[model samples]
Target: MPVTIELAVAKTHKFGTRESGDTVELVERPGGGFSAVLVDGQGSGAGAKRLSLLVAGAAVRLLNEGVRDGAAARAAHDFLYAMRDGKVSAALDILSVDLASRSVLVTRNSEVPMLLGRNGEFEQISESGGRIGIYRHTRPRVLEFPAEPGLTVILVSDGIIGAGGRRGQPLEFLATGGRVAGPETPAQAIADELLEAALVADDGRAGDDMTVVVLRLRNVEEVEPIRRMALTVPLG
Candidate 1:
């Protein structure tokens, strides 16, 4: 049985803010893979947005040029470190479907953990990759695993995970009977659900930029090999 892979993203700015500081980019590898890059810049509003764009853009370009995931992440860190003079930082998480390596790769430089869903269980892939641009030679922690069906991954920025921390009601994924959304669920729906759950945890008001990335691999019903992508924006 052939497996189909899908990616979904959902993000928003903080309440009362004009722009979000988080940016997510998808770039295809020159070889035979693709990566989803998420960057949460330090601070809030447009200022942080600039940092996010610079870091993410650099990484995306490097990945598109056939650079390895870890090297690209390191280059992005160096670029931001030099550009910002080590005054600021950003969280970067790169989830790649690397067919060249025949594996799924996770390159992370964030304080937040990447959640994995397998057999209806949620496991945290926590690593001390450290945020980018705060120090020289800052590098991302890379994890590689074989690509298989019934695998789901969730990457989130601090905003979504830290929501409602002050109130002590942080976001949680406790469904009816401890059931979790696994690979069977659509990626877009998982992304939407996680974003909404974060909002609810924060009392319907966001304090910082929130971002969600869901990647799922499952059995395909038919042989379809066309690539697809869609984007939506609120024009106000």
Candidate 2:
């Protein structure tokens, strides 16, 4: 009847750099579903940070509504159409999970990737929309389906994928570790592991605006599913 949705989120920038090129945010809707927004923002210069924020805000405002993923994506498409000329819109890749339908929404640009893994298998569902700030016709692909128990969603900007080269491995490790060991749920532990890796990268000076988001859905119920907020993991 009720379920706990645990989330682990972390962000880091290039070593000794003032701003990171990564941005991550999560929103739990009032009804049943939740949204996770990750924007890579265009450029590596001073202007790039603003670009990332712009895209992130628009993502939450337009895509965060009650509208379905496809509809929300269509609205985002229209928003980019208006930004002609040199002015650029933030290139964004978004992932949303709906507990009610047990579905996940994935929309992304080439720079970002969402790895959907089940039972240690990995799949990349990334759709490229064009250069982040360049401004072209942007239409996001929405992957909607029934998410079964043990489904893990990992979102990352290019930096982490490049830095750790553990892109999908860490998630797989977290998932497998949870199933075999007995300290924490696979979802929470994996999320923590992903973020902690990024934090260490920050310390190690492998920074390049690293950001990671981990969303795991488990313990499914056929009817009367309740959604609650709290990131919990059992440690052994």
Candidate 3:
């Protein structure tokens, strides 16, 4: 447990929308691990926010039920495709830290590449495949690596990409992540950095359900074994 883990997520409903089509869920493995799921349901504008919730719920439920990351992702896809009659789609990504395996795992069904940072180098990762709920057998591409200090992973929704496109702005996600990911930098900062860039133009664009998820691990720890968490949200 020498390496501390940080999972920072920043997101908003597409401007002027009552609810975001984006969904995020987490499950702490009973056997010793963690998994975070991000699903962008309305990215394609054909699906509804409810679609995203169903996918997220299925994936997270299976993850909590001890299903593997890849399996959970695929099952979630199947569930969505079955429920929607293969007419809708969503971007799904899962980031996991497994103590038993001493590794990190990612299952990506997103068009926007997930930025990976390690050993002071950064790269964007993407695999060719249709998004969830589109193809009958659409399976998420999986990535696994040793759990090392200074490892970083980021995932964004289609809203982010379109925002960048409409604003005539391009994001260097890997570079930005590498630069901002000092040992002291929290994952939230990295997510905020990218999100701020995504919100460059005027509010309420075509694809508005903006979301950014960052997973970071650093070789630092406190003597105590207590886990702390914080949140800032209006309780309505």
Candidate 4:
């Protein structure tokens, strides 16, 4: 059986600014599994962007080198911690999936929540790890399980949750919308809807950097063998 991965990302800067502190990195292994990371800097702007890039870049590089998810998270934590004097802080989430084994590993160290959908239903997968550069000891919680078909995972920054005030929770919005949407609905469409909803809730101006990443796995079914009839011909 073959596995297909579909991904979509949407982002907006704080207050409609040009630069955003949130960044996403995807590393595709030539042979098999792929790793993705979403990093949110402490604040919006150049400094935030710099910090987010640094952490995200490190995570991607480490994962590309075949490092485990836990090790990669620790490396990013230490990398940022080294710059504690500069007050560098960032929140991030890491997800890796192996097509062959159908395994998935997710590590999160952010206030924002991640949603996982299976069987046309969505649930929040929450984990907490202190922000990098702020905590002396960081231990990100890891979630591991089989990456079954028809599974979807959504990762977002704090801006997304903060949108539409405390009353409007993006998690609930996504769950309800996903349940209403047909299974054939594309993952990218859900991503777009989430971002648009957040933008509208922010009153047309995002007060903080917002990012949403949607990942879906599709199962490839086995095909039946073709039947053919061969005729032997005599050659001179």
Assess candidate 4 and give its lDDT. Answer: 0.76
Winning candidate number (TM-score): 1
Clashing pairs in 1: none
| Preferred candidate (lDDT higher): 1 or 2 | 1
Candidate 3 lDDT by residue in tens digits, 52-158? 88899999889889898888888998998889899888888888999888899988887677788887777878863458887887877888988888888888886
Error of 2 at 28 (Å): 3.4
Per-candidate clash tally: 0, 3, 1, 0
Which candidate leads the pack in lDDT? 1
Q: Among all windows of ten consecutive residues in candidate 3, which has the lowest summed lDDT?
A: 198-207
Candidate 3 overall Cα lDDT vs. reference? 0.79
lDDT, candidate 1, at 31: 80
Shift of residue 154 alpha carbon in model 2, Å:
0.5
Instruction: Give all TM-scores, in the order shown.
Output: 0.94, 0.72, 0.90, 0.85
Show pairs that collide, candidate 2.
14-207, 183-234, 184-234
Give lDDT: candidate 3, residue 90. 84
Candidate 2 segments whose C-alpha is farther than 4 A from its true place: 1-4, 80-89, 125-128, 131-135, 164-188, 195-203, 220-236
Off by over 4 Å in 4: 166-171, 174-181, 221-236
Mind giving the per-residue lDDT tens digits that candidate 4 earns over 149-205?
788888888888778774453335555446533577666777778888888877777
What is residue 204's positional error in candidate 2, in angstroms? 1.0
The lDDT for every candidate, in the order shown, is 0.84, 0.59, 0.79, 0.76
lDDT sort, best first:
1, 3, 4, 2
TM-score rank order: 1, 3, 4, 2
